[PDB]
């Protein structure tokens, strides 16, 4: 009513492409507890690395790591089919606990983090500086990851749909499509956003008839 225990910085986890996904925002009143559900990046994925982050940067790395833990015994499934519920819990004492629960297996793994963990009152204010100071640089970073993943999806889902079709697809088309996948898979390895969209364009155009069959 006169004071207010708050979070000076955003708390969350590294997600695919080295982006920080925030779970609990900046200047949040403790106690607080938010959850959010995630999944796997490669098919037949058996574990996920929860890597805990503090700070206002979009790149995972430009932020302060607080810890890191795996949840395994993920029963084999298609990618992005598991339900990994990551929960952040801060009590009256300032202590952050972070679980991940496989909603199938029913397994669980928590890390507890002392209120004294992560950046001191000075670094907090630098973090906020370097955030405002690199708003755009990270704006460019975010939309590239989004493109990397938007790309990375399109690749996987096409390779599926090509197996799914088989005989049904003109060899004519399956050549034009198999080349445009190879090119897009290379584009993904670089950092050139344009190029990724360029090969996603090429795929889109030569894939007209593949789409039809899947539908």
């Amino acid at each position: 009513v006169l004071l207010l225990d708050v979070t000076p910085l955003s708390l969350g986890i590294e997600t695919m492409g080295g982006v920080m996904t925030t779970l609990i925002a900046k200047n949040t009143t403790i106690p607080t507890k938010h959850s959010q559900v995630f999944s796997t990046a490669e098919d037949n994925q058996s574990a996920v690395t929860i890597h805990v982050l503090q700070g206002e940067r979009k790149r995972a790395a430009d932020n302060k790591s607080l810890g890191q833990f795996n949840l395994d015994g993920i029963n084999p499934a298609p990618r992005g089919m598991p339900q990994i519920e990551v929960t952040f819990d801060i009590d009256a004492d300032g202590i952050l606990h972070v679980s991940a629960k496989d909603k199938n297996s029913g397994k669980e793994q928590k890390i507890t983090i002392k209120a004294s963990s992560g950046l001191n009152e000075d670094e907090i204010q630098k973090m906020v500086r370097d955030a405002e100071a690199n708003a755009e640089a990270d704006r460019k970073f975010e939309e590239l990851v989004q493109t990397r993943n938007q790309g990375d999806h399109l690749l996987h889902s096409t390779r599926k749909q090509v197996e799914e079709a088989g005989d049904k697809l003109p060899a004519d088309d399956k050549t034009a499509i198999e080349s445009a996948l190879t090119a897009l898979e290379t584009a993904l390895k670089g950092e050139d956003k344009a190029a990724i969209e360029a090969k996603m364009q090429e795929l889109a155009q030569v894939s007209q008839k593949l789409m039809e069959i899947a539908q």
């Binding site: 695919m16 996904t21 995630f38 490669e42 996920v48 990618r79 993943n149």
Partner: peptide, 4 residues
């Protein structure tokens, strides 16, 4: 590796 985790995805949204």
């Amino acid at each position: 590796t985790l995805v949204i």
